[PDB]
């Protein structure tokens, strides 16, 4: 046992290495789909920059985990980083839709650890998840809706000069 | 009863007033450890600023804990501080071990009154647990096991060598 | 095709690809390596900001090999990242000889990708290795050798003391 | 032979005089172009500002090597710059395309410049060659290769606002 641990479960130890792989997955697949949207024949260059954000937080947000566990005492066990489920996003909507899919399964898997957290009477695992994470995960979920609806009633993806637009005005 | 009192239980009253005794006590204990390190025998100038430094912190958690009593129109009755432990702290490994045990020591009471609070449906006592201890004690319990860690390789308390060098270089 | 394409190799295209996964491999490494040191029971801070900033750095090496595809005019295939050798790095020197062995291994991947760019005649592709990632290897090597080097002479792993004065003094 | 000649092949030396002209007419086609775009019937502002910073850096190229023709102890001859292939240049997308084209075709000389300066074992004429021009033509081929994509996507020709909104929202 660390000379630090208290408190400290087990489970709670090993959800924390399962959300920290799910961070560096996020960070992946906008990694993903930043890149798609610098290629010659998608050039949306604002799309291509937002996701790069994104993905540089996802980053961040996992360094915050591994920090955690070191804090509370638990060890780091990391796993491969899988890809990406597509190589081509489609569209600048059908990537703000699969990014808002990723947001609500990153935070479905935040609900769970705090689950956890509860049933194991850790009320600073509690307040860790919702001082640095659940707010992250519902601004990041309504920006991602306003994006997706803007987008659709815009006329994209079939009206090119949408996404055109859209790059311009609300990511540029 | 006071005008301000709602939702305050009279047990989570009585367990702020225990817990105001704990932190004044944490407040001397530090204080020793820290003219421990002021003996012209001793004379690791750097241990004595960081234990007063924490002495001063401690004071400062014991006063949070007394305006919140206050707040919620709970009534402070204070009890004599208890002497530490020691008059001789025997090293710098051996005084950072003792304070690693006390941050324990004081973290097993807010965790308590944490299940209390949450036992008598207290949100507010809760969140300001949460808020203003819960991650204070994790970042002090991870800080002292990183400083007894670094004089235990070093090779203290056998090595004078080890203490004046991690006096310089890690509380310098 | 892609209308940007112009004396680049499908040879060339799948070897940049590869090359893209090794730097994002190497990043996890170095990102596993600087949790390590953050231990409570290794407690090396600097160690831990080194092989943190080496992180953040082949996450860039990764990125601008991802610029380089789209500049050419390739497509960027992703793959599973593989989780790093250990789980736990034994020690400041046995880090430091498992990243220049890492170094070294990245460098052998940068000269086959630079021997493939000169069979193909692809001048381009030469000076882009050359010009970002060739000399970035060599000083990366350097240093590693160096610090390997400072470590053995002052009698590390077994002295705690020589890697806690080289954590203060070399990468504080 | 010039004082300061030093391997520097005659066929290198020719080589360079006939890349010094298609630099010029390249300046020559962008001057164009910029002009058709000032037309009070077609009044593109952005369009044509940034074919006339094109036709300058163009002019730019040619300076250089006419500097290294000299550095090297080679001899400029100068022949005449042919007129460009159109004096209506139809639109916006019509001239991005044609300037893709353009490019490719320099970029086609310079590495058959590079060739000859490898088989000749010139390495200065190929670190000039890679340094100063192979970059420089992919960056402008992926630039105007991103430009035509955007143009095509927002409706180009078709659509009567998408050059319109290009010349302000990109080339502006
Ligand atoms: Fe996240
Ligand atoms: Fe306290
Ligand atoms: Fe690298
Ligand atoms: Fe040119």
Chains 1, 2, 3, 4 share one sequence.
Not at 24 to 38: E, P, R, T
């Amino acid at each position: 046992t660390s000379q630090v641990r208290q408190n400290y479960h087990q489970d709670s130890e090993k959800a924390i290495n399962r959300q920290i792989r799910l961070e560096l997955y996020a960070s992946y697949v906008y990694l993903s789909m930043s890149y798609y949207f610098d290629r010659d024949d998608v050039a949306l260059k604002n799309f291509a920059k937002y996701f790069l954000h994104q993905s540089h937080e996802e980053r961040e947000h996992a360094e915050k985990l591994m920090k955690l566990q070191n804090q509370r005492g638990g060890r780091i066990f990391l796993q491969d980083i899988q890809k990406p489920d597509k190589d081509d996003w489609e569209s600048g909507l059908r990537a703000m839709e699969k990014a808002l899919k990723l947001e609500k399964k990153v935070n479905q898997s935040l609900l769970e650890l705090h689950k956890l957290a509860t049933k194991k009477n850790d009320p600073h695992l509690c307040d860790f998840i919702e001082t640095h994470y659940l707010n992250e995960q519902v601004k990041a979920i309504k920006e991602l809706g306003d994006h997706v609806t803007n987008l659709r009633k815009m006329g994209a993806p079939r009206s090119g000069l949408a996404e055109y637009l859209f790059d311009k005005h609300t990511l540029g």
